[PDB]
Design a protein around this ligand. Structure first.
Ligand SMILES: Cc1ccc2c(c1)sc(-c1ccc(N(C)C)cc1)[n+]2C
Ligand SMILES: Cc1ccc2c(c1)sc(-c1ccc(N(C)C)cc1)[n+]2C
Ligand SMILES: Cc1ccc2c(c1)sc(-c1ccc(N(C)C)cc1)[n+]2C
Ligand SMILES: Cc1ccc2c(c1)sc(-c1ccc(N(C)C)cc1)[n+]2C
Ligand SMILES: Cc1ccc2c(c1)sc(-c1ccc(N(C)C)cc1)[n+]2C
Ligand SMILES: Cc1ccc2c(c1)sc(-c1ccc(N(C)C)cc1)[n+]2C
Ligand SMILES: Cc1ccc2c(c1)sc(-c1ccc(N(C)C)cc1)[n+]2C
Ligand SMILES: Cc1ccc2c(c1)sc(-c1ccc(N(C)C)cc1)[n+]2C
Lengths: 61, 61, 61, 61, 61, 61, 61, 61
């Protein structure tokens, strides 16, 4: 009955340095799912599913 | 009955430096799903599904 | 009845330095799922499934 | 009834330096699931399944 | 007699990302010389002295 | 008599990522010379002295 | 008489990632010379002295 | 008479990752010379003295 939060962190990203030097980056997709290059991502979910970088081929029900 | 939040963080991204030097970046998609290049993203969901970089091939019900 | 959080961390990423030098990066997908290059990702889920870099081939029910 | 958290850490990644020099990186997927290159990832799940880098071939029910 | 320069670089700085988070930065100088915080500086000198971040206490001739 | 330069580099800095998190940075100088924090600096000198981060106490001739 | 330079490098710095987390950084100088924190520095000198991070106490001639 | 340089390197630094976590860094100088923290430095000198991190107490001629 006396919750006291103070300077708390939940789902936090900080202090990120990235260098990426490429000559050729190619993605070829035929009927599927491709996720590429996810950087410095943060989230908080309450009462639900939390997905960040999810690829599902297909759902053929 | 006495929740006291103070300087709390939930789903936070800060301090991000990114350099990307590419000569050729190509994406070719035929009937699928492609997600590429997600940087410095933050969210908070209450009572729901929270997705950031999600690719689903297809839903053929 | 007297929860007192103070400077706590849950699902936190900080202080990350990355260099990536490639000449050719290629992804070829035919009806599947490919996830590539997930860096500096943090999340917190309450009452749900938490996935970061998940690839599912397909769901043929 | 008197939980007192102080400077605690749960699912935390910090102080990570990575260099990756490649001439050719290729992924070829035909109807499966491929996950590649997951770095500096942290999460905390309460009352749910927590997966980071999971690849499932397919679910044919 | 046939100098042919092509895409040459001399005194060049490029691709620099910097983050600096400080709570207190102080400089106290009494009769001296202080240089602080020189970032991403480039020069080319022909037939002369080239100095970038030089501090000389004093010249009492 | 047929100098042919092509894509040459002399005094070059590139691809630099820096993070600096400090609580207190102090410099106290009394009659001297202090140089601090020189990052990503490049120069080319022809027929002269080339100094980057030089501190001389004093010159009492 | 047929110098042919091609993709040559002289005094070059590239691909540098640095993280520095300090609580207290102090410099106290009384009549001397202090150099601190020189990162990712490159130079080329022709027919002269080349110094990068040089500290001289004093020159009392 | 037919010098042919090709993809040569002279005074080159590349691919450097550094993390430094300190609680207290102090320098106290009284009439001397202190050099501290030189990282990822490259130079090329022709017909001259090349010094990188040199500290001289004093020159009392
Ligand atoms: C007094 C009281 C009772 C419940 C209570 C709190 C305080 S604080 C809290 C909470 C719930 C979910 C989450 N996430 C989304 C990670 C974080 C915190 N609850 C559930
Ligand atoms: C007084 C009181 C009681 C409950 C309570 C709060 C305050 S604040 C809170 C909460 C709910 C969901 C989330 N997320 C979306 C992660 C974060 C915090 N609850 C559950
Ligand atoms: C007063 C009180 C009672 C319970 C309580 C809290 C405060 S805070 C908390 C909690 C719940 C889920 C999570 N995650 C999502 C890992 C982290 C913390 N509980 C369960
Ligand atoms: C007084 C009281 C009662 C329960 C209680 C606490 C305090 S704190 C806590 C807790 C639950 C889940 C997690 N994870 C998600 C790792 C971390 C902490 N519980 C369950
Ligand atoms: C045809 C010809 C002859 C000489 C010649 C050139 C072209 S270009 C050049 C030169 C001089 C100084 C410098 N710096 C300031 C480092 C760089 C290059 N020289 C000496
Ligand atoms: C034909 C010919 C003759 C001389 C000659 C060249 C070509 S190119 C060159 C030169 C001089 C100084 C420098 N630096 C400042 C490093 C770089 C290059 N020289 C001196
Ligand atoms: C045709 C010709 C003849 C001489 C010649 C060149 C080309 S290029 C060169 C040279 C001089 C100084 C330096 N530094 C400053 C290290 C690097 C290279 N030389 C001496
Ligand atoms: C044909 C010819 C004659 C001389 C000659 C060259 C080619 S190339 C070269 C040279 C001189 C100094 C340096 N440094 C500064 C390390 C590097 C290279 N020289 C002296």
């Amino acid at each position: 009955v006396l919750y006291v939060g103070s300077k708390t962190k939940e789902g936090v990203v900080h202090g990120v340095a990235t260098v990426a030097e490429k000559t050729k980056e190619q993605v070829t997709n035929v009927g599927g799912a491709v996720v590429t290059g996810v950087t410095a991502v943060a989230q908080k979910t309450v009462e639900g599913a939390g997905s960040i970088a999810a690829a599902t081929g297909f759902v053929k029900k």
